[PDB]
């Protein structure tokens, strides 16, 4: 049975609005949620993170790209609603008084896609992962205790003769080396910023369902929904309640997420291409030549012939009118599986749409991503992140008593105290609240404390912009005053 009233939940985790409500009150609730999301410092941080080219011209940032993803998602949602209304299935599916929340949730999910990426993107995550992999060596805990354990932490070594504590070390060691943008985005929205969003809004940004501490093979019935980590170990309990609030089974997905994913796949191509022309790399004639060589008739021929700042404004429209109805029909056709949360495919994943998207992608890979500047920026970002982690390493070499004393107020740790004071207030408060709730008598306290210390370091590193991290890296290395 399909009933969207069981999925669009307007309750909250704190000070939730209880009782009965009408359409107007629900709409006001979701407008308030939009008000909290739009006026957040995370968006203004998105304002100054690079997409492809270094920040100078009128090249695009994360924010302008999010503004295209939002538009595409809203247009697809409107097409779906119109097609459902035409077939007289809108009232039978429980969506009669929930169209506004539908569109608002899709738009806000599209706006929050890039909230949790670290500086420099794909090359920031790689650096963090390699650093922590060198420090922890998670591949040595997959089986019974060894004598050649390469871990550098005494408390995280698998010391044979104790099986209840080992399971926990395995989980922590595997989790700490799987930083991912979406899991950090969930953590940021819930724990670090404390925005208190509705359950549906939080579920709209849960893209993948694989736990970060997973070891082994995934079931054949979920191999696509579990291709990337979805959430960390510190949010597990939270996620559990989320499922109880949205009637989701284990490793399942919230319906509207599919729409958002679709949007992130269209814009991803076309926008990049345009910027290549604006930076004076090549021109329109070369665009058509490369497209024709790498190859369709309708869009390409209309764009090339009707053209003989206004070429792209004509090229987008045709692509949208060719792609959006296909996504709407794919959503409506497989609706029961999506509502169940077990659809193991994507909307746009053998039609001509795949061919056109692959054409755009391969042209972009051949003529844009191979430019020396992108490549140089990518290497520089990797080195900067590694250097920052090396600089902040001494905070992880302390002991439980020393770090605890350092948190409460020292005269014995000048360098460490200054480094700790350099961190932000919100991250330290999050650490304090996380550690306070732990039982202070179990033999599992040091493990959790180390996990939360590493989490604090990763939050600090990932909460920067490109320019801020770069400048701070040169300042801490005594290269500039």
């Amino acid at each position: 049975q399909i009933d969207f009233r069981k999925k669009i939940n307007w309750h909250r985790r704190y000070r939730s609005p209880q009782g009965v409500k009408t359409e107007h009150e629900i709409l006001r609730i979701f407008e308030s949620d939009r008000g909290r999301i739009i006026n957040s410092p995370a968006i203004r941080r998105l304002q100054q993170k690079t997409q492809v080219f270094p920040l100078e011209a009128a090249v695009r940032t994360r924010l302008t790209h999010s503004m295209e993803v939002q538009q595409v998602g809203r247009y697809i949602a409107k097409e779906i609603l119109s097609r459902l209304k035409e077939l007289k299935l809108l009232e039978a599916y429980g969506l009669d008084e929930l169209t506004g929340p539908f569109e608002s949730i899709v738009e806000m999910s599209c706006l929050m896609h890039d909230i949790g990426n670290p500086p420099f993107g794909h090359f920031g995550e790689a650096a963090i992962n390699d650093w922590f992999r060198q420090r922890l060596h998670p591949e040595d805990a997959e089986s019974q205790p060894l004598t050649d354990d390469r871990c550098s932490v005494a408390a995280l070594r698998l010391r044979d003769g104790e099986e209840p504590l080992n399971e926990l070390r395995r989980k922590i060691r595997q989790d700490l080396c799987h930083f991912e943008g979406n899991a950090q985005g969930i953590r940021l929205v819930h724990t670090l910023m404390r925005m208190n969003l509705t359950w549906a809004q939080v579920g709209g940004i849960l893209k993948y369902t694989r736990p970060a501490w997973w070891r082994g093979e995934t079931p054949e019935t979920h191999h696509y929904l579990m291709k990337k980590p979805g959430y960390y170990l510190s949010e597990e309990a939270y996620i559990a309640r989320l499922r109880k609030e949205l009637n989701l089974a284990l490793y399942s997905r919230f319906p509207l997420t599919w729409i958002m994913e679709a949007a992130d796949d269209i814009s991803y191509c076309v926008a990049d291409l345009e910027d290549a022309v604006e930076k004076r790399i090549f021109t329109v004639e070369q665009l058509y030549h490369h497209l024709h060589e790498a190859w369709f008739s309708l869009v390409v021929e209309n764009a090339w012939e009707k053209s003989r700042d206004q070429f792209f404004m004509y090229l987008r429209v045709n692509t949208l009118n060719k792609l959006v109805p296909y996504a709407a029909q794919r959503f409506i056709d497989n609706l029961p599986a999506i509502f169940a949360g077990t659809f193991n495919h994507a909307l746009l994943e053998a039609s001509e749409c795949s061919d056109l998207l692959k054409l755009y992608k391969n042209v972009a890979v051949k003529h844009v991503f191979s430019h020396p500047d992108v490549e140089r920026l990518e290497l520089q970002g990797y080195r900067v992140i590694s250097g920052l982690l090396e600089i902040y390493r001494p905070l992880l070499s302390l002991s439980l008593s020393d770090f605890t004393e350092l948190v409460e107020k020292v005269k014995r740790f000048p360098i460490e105290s200054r480094l700790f004071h350099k961190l932000s207030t919100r991250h330290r408060l999050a650490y304090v609240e996380a550690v306070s709730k732990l039982p202070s008598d179990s033999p599992e306290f040091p493990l959790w404390e180390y996990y939360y210390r590493c989490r604090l370091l990763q939050d600090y590193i990932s909460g920067m912009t490109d320019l801020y991290a770069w400048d701070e890296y040169r300042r801490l290395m005594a290269v500039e005053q």
């Binding site: 991912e180 093979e217 994943e349």
Partner: protein, 83 residues
């Protein structure tokens, strides 16, 4: 693009196989007939003789690398009973 952790797991499996005195040969391409990407792996030894060879097809590379790593771990379990 491909996620870093999947590549790290694949590299770890490759290193585990190589430390077992085996050779891993990797080849890849794209098949436009099936509209997918294909990866073939050929396991060998110190002498250079084929033992097991398999090819995988998929449209998304994240699933493809996971399948390859799973197959590599399965063979390692099979042939690590001895020899």
């Amino acid at each position: 693009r491909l996620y870093s952790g999947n590549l790290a797991a694949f590299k770890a499996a490759t290193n585990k196989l190589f430390q077992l005195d085996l050779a891993v040969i990797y080849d890849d391409w794209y098949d436009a007939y099936t509209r997918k990407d294909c990866i073939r792996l050929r396991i060998e030894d110190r002498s250079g003789n084929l033992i097991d060879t398999s090819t995988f097809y998929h449209h998304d590379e994240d699933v493809l690398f996971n399948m390859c790593t799973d197959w590599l771990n399965h063979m390692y379990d099979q042939l690590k009973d001895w020899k």
